[PDB]
Ligand binder design. Structure first.
Ligand SMILES: NC(=O)C1=CN([C@@H]2O[C@H](COP(=O)(O)OP(=O)(O)OC[C@H]3O[C@@H](n4cnc5c(N)ncnc54)[C@H](O)[C@@H]3O)[C@@H](O)[C@H]2O)C=CC1
Ligand SMILES: Cc1cc2nc3c(=O)[nH]c(=O)nc-3n(C[C@H](O)[C@H](O)[C@H](O)COP(=O)(O)O)c2cc1C
Ligand code: SF4
Ligand code: SF4
Ligand code: SF4
Ligand code: FES
Ligand code: FES
Ligand SMILES: [K+]
Lengths: 430, 44, 263, 213
């Protein structure tokens, strides 16, 4: 296959994405959830890990680590400590609202994914660290978890398989860094959400000191569909090493801002002009697209014509796929104000632990706040470039990377506009 | 009959401030006994 | 023996499993710079001054916390190790106040000394610096929190060695402030050792304050007699007058601490 | 806005705070979600329960949470100052949170922020003198396709115009509660001009389930 996209409704994993069907247990069973879960649990951990490794599923959190290779790190005998699945449900990324829709409208798919994933890794329970701001979504998930305990689908003797598995929901308290996996693990432990260093990885020392996998909502909820439909079905979509379907969050300057599931290697132009009603003012009104959420660098309009919406094609476009949350910006946008507001986000959402993020992200915000007005001179663009390179790669987690990257994309694709901003400031203020 | 036009997620219009915690209190009886680290706290 | 072979700048050295990169470089006589690392405190890894290059590895590792894998060549003097050091020292000195003359840590400052040894020689910070409210933690430790570099040796000492658990970090981001969050008076029996392990002038000795300066002091090595521990001390004197009392390292007695009575 | 505390007559360790007995049962249920030996993991939900009881956190809820979990009080102070939901100041009864990050700013959240300001007569950070509304300006609330949006204490009010948010503030002043959803024609997150996807009926159980299962 060469052309990707136009995903048919029979291949949608996340049916009832829009709230149009019943989200509860009787509606989830009538759409395919909890079907033959006892057989999936009885076929063992190695079979489920083989079905995830066959499927080519990469981590939907945004980094794209291979899911079966990641979960096989827990496939080891116990050392006295319990094992845990921890389901990452924070989703603080600007642009991104897909995990909100999965928790809110398909909660039993997430709970069955907790059961299947924690079966595959020998995990005792599942801690769904949901975002604290998603209160109605968290109570929604708790109603579904009560329906799953009352039906015998989880808990003592889950689905009749003899494998005991609890599911807990831990609510956050308003910290974007508590979606980072080690900071999330520390936030579950009752501490400040400060990221641990790596190594130890969570498969060695995770939550409470136990072996742990931290996985996104979307990479957990697709796993019962992968284990029912087969890994070859899921690997039949997208390019090679870019398999599956992906939820896309098209927001910003589009006609119909939507959440949609689409095939993996779909073009960006096809996605925006099909599911979002196109850019406001036409495709010629397009200025730039932040492809996959705020951490990824933007791409200008010339790159958006041909680029595919998977990991490798966006890496070749010197950006990333990320959360696949498409932020569309038209020609009427002060792009320096938008990227400086994005860096203002990244200094308000920064835990202060290591020196490069704590100091340099505030310093990049001050330089970008001067760049909006133009209160600078064009040596400071290269200064800010080197400051972004000093933050990038030198931090504890990837929020330093995620703050340095939009500055780098803005400089790389809009240095002349920054320069003319500063020179009109210089001429009308002197 | 089949329907696709009505929004079925209307239950969150009637959640109060203690909905999550009352659901956790209800779910506390369905759960397994927790593992023990052998001590009461790391300061013990 | 289960010693693994690692390389510090190509020089072979046999280390125990569990050795960090910093200890493996210490075994060949090289001292990696650090601010949060202290060999008697738990590892924080939150100042990023120890970032060293492993060759054939496109990312600098935190040498205080990273265990050495077998066959690693640690490049302590390579170009991107030095770029990591100068960048992290630039961010450390970005919001740091220009207090070196009015600072008691001046001349014996780690931030000064390894800014000379590993930092650049000038600034690119054209912004306004921050100013942190000063905390009142007692009659012994003067606190000027604008000079804090948030290395959290405070919290680790008071949590682990002093056993108090009443210092911490409040806030978040660049507004993250080290303190007690309440008007609390940190009075342990060992409470003056946070003066020693503060690498910067954020925690100085309030009786010693403003009186002397380290180069003009004469370091005489003596014994504590305030108790029967026999704590080994340096009595530093200036022109026939006793100025302060610092500890000596003695692993079998007082490892590098003293009590507040001694101090 | 300050991450240090000073004793005022309204906020001191002798300020009366105590949980209600059903809140003690909910705290027991919270603590029984974590392993024995790690009762300190229940600091965030019990402190959030204290805030949902009291409205904000004086420094007696922090000390009570430190007492009933046997953790040091500084380790509750750290958590209360780290996370932005814990109100260390007494907020109004409807704590409006306008999201002004880039996907909401691109869809004109500044119009809604100005509308709330000229509707209430306050600015960002201030509380109305009848203690009903506190307006602050927050980061991404995770409702980006329903931009522009606000949050009023638990609920997302989405797809807003200034008329919509003035209507919401009006019927909050009337003692009623509005519906937590989009204020356009759409329901949650679909395209507004009809569904571009999921129009077919879902396939039900057993569709495409592989052999050997
Ligand atoms: N989904 C969201 O709401 C957000 C997502 N992100 C995404 O987060 C990404 C960065 O996340 P990270 O976890 O720091 O990225 P990545 O470097 O670490 O690793 C991703 C996953 O692979 C695992 N892993 C990688 N190498 C491993 C090894 N050798 N051994 C064991 N496990 C290993 C990690 O434990 C982690 O769970 C960014 O690319 C960004 O797109 C960022 C912000 C918000
Ligand atoms: C600052 C930061 C915030 C993150 N926030 C989230 C998040 O909110 N939700 C999420 O699923 N992953 C988030 N991640 C990515 C996680 O670190 C991790 O990769 C992911 O949650 C689990 O891996 P997975 O992709 O295999 O599911 C964040 C990463 C960073 C650096
Ligand atoms: S880079 Fe920023 S987000 Fe990460 S540990 Fe450091 S302060 Fe925290
Ligand atoms: S702490 Fe060090 S660098 Fe800072 S003012 Fe004092 S002597 Fe100067
Ligand atoms: S006061 Fe000194 S020892 Fe304490 S955290 Fe700050 S720099 Fe480190
Ligand atoms: S010394 Fe390793 S980071 Fe501080
Ligand atoms: S940007 Fe406002 S909700 Fe995500
Ligand atoms: K000092």
């Amino acid at each position: 296959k060469t052309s990707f996209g136009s995903l048919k409704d029979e291949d949608r994993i996340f049916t009832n994405l829009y709230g149009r069907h019943d989200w509860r247990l009787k509606g989830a069973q009538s759409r395919g959830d909890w079907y033959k879960t006892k057989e999936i649990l009885l076929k063992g951990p190695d079979w489920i890990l083989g079905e995830v490794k066959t499927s080519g599923l990469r981590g939907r959190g945004g980094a794209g680590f291979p899911t079966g290779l990641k979960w096989s790190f827990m496939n080891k005998p116990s050392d006295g400590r319990p094992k845990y699945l921890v389901v990452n449900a924070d989703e603080g990324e600007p642009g991104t609202c897909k995990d909100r829709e999965i928790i809110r409208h398909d909660p039993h798919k997430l709970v069955e994914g907790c059961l299947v994933g924690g079966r595959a890794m020998g995990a005792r329970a599942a801690y769904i660290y949901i975002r604290g701001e998603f209160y109605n979504e968290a109570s929604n998930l708790q109603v579904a978890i009560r329906e799953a305990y009352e039906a015998g689908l989880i808990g003592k003797n889950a689905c009749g398989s003899g494998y005991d598995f609890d599911v807990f929901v831990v609510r956050g308290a308003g910290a974007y860094i508590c979606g980072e996996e080690t900071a999330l693990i520390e936030s579950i432990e009752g501490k400040q959400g400060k990221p641990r260093l790596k190594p130890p990885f969570p498969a060695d020392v995770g939550v409470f000191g136990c072996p742990t996998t931290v996985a996104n909502v979307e990479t957990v909820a697709v796993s019962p569909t992968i284990c029912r439909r087969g890994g070859a079905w899921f690997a039949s979509f997208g390019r090679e090493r870019n398999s599956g379907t992906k939820l896309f969050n098209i927001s910003g300057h589009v006609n119909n801002p939507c959440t949609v599931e689409e095939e993996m290697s779909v073009p960006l132009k096809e996605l925006i002009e099909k599911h979002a009603g196109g850019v406001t003012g036409g495709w010629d009104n397009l200025l730039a697209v932040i492809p996959g959420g705020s951490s990824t660098p933007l791409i200008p309009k010339s790159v958006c014509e041909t680029v595919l919406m998977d990991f490798d094609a966006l890496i070749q476009a010197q950006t990333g796929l990320g959360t696949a949350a498409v932020i569309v910006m038209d020609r009427s946008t002060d792009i320096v104000k938008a990227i400086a507001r994005l860096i203002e986000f990244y200094k308000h959402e920064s835990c202060g632990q290591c020196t490069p993020c704590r100091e340099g992200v505030d310093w990049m915000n001050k330089v970008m706040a001067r760049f909006v007005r133009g209160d600078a001179r064009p040596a400071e663009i290269d200064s800010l470039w080197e400051i972004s390179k000093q933050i990038e790669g030198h931090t504890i987690c990837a929020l330093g990377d995620g703050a340095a990257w939009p500055v780098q994309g803005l400089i790389r694709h809009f240095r002349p506009e920054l320069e003319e901003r500063m020179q009109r400031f210089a001429q009308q203020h002197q | 009959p089949f329907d696709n036009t009505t929004y079925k997620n209307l239950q969150h219009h009637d959640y109060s401030t203690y909905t999550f915690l009352d659901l956790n209190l209800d779910l506390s009886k369905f759960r397994m006994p927790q593992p023990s680290s052998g001590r009461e706290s790391p300061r013990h | 023996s289960n010693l693994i072979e690692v390389f510090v700048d190509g020089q072979s050295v046999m280390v125990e499993p569990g050795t960090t990169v910093l200890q493996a470089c210490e075994k060949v006589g090289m001292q990696i710079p650090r601010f949060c690392y202290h060999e008697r405190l738990s590892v924080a890894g939150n100042c990023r001054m120890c970032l060293v290059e492993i060759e054939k590895a496109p990312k600098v590792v935190a040498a205080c916390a990273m265990p050495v894998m077998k066959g690693w060549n640690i490049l302590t003097n390579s170009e991107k190790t030095k770029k990591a050091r100068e960048g992290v020292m630039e961010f450390l000195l970005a919001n740091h106040p220009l207090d070196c003359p009015i600072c008691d840590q001046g001349g014996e400052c780690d931030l000064q000394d390894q800014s000379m040894m590993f930092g650049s020689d000038r600034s690119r910070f054209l912004e306004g610096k921050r100013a942190v409210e000063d905390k009142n933690i007692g009659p012994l430790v003067k606190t000027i929190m604008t000079r804090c570099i948030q290395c959290t040796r405070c919290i680790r000492f008071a949590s682990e060695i002093a056993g108090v658990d009443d210092l911490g970090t409040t806030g978040r981001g660049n507004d993250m402030q080290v303190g007690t969050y309440i008007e609390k008076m940190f009075m342990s029996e060992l409470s003056g050792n946070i003066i020693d392990i503060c690498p910067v002038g954020a925690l100085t000795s309030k009786p010693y304050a403003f009186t002397a300066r380290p180069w003009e002091t004469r370091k005489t090595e003596s014994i504590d007699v305030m108790d029967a521990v026999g704590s080994n001390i340096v009595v530093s004197t200036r022109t026939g007058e006793v100025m302060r009392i610092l500890p000596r390292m003695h692993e079998d007695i007082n490892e590098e601490w003293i009590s507040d009575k001694t101090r | 806005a300050l991450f240090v505390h000073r004793d005022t007559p309204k906020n001191n360790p002798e300020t009366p705070f105590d949980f209600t007995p059903e809140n003690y049962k909910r705290i027991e249920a919270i603590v029984k979600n974590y392993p024995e030996g790690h009762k300190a993991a229940a600091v965030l939900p019990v402190l959030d329960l204290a805030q949902r009881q009291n409205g904000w956190l004086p420094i007696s809820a922090m000390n009570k949470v430190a007492e009933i979990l046997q953790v040091p009080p500084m380790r509750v102070y750290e958590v209360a100052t780290f996370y932005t939901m814990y109100n260390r100041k007494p907020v109004g009864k409807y704590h409006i949170q306008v999201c002004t990050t880039t996907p909401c700013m691109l869809r004109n959240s500044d119009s809604i922020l100005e509308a709330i300001q000229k509707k209430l007569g306050i600015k960002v950070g201030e509380t109305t003198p009848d203690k009903l509304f506190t307006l602050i300006e927050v980061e991404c609330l995770g409702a980006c396709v329903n931009a522009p949006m606000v949050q009023i204490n638990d609920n997302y009010y989405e797809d807003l115009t200034p008329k919509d948010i003035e209507e919401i503030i009006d019927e909050l002043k009337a003692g009623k509660i509005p519906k937590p959803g989009p204020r356009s024609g759409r329901f949650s997150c679909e395209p507004a001009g009809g569904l571009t996807s999921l129009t077919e009926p879902p396939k039900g159980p057993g569709f495409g389930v592989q052999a050997g299962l």
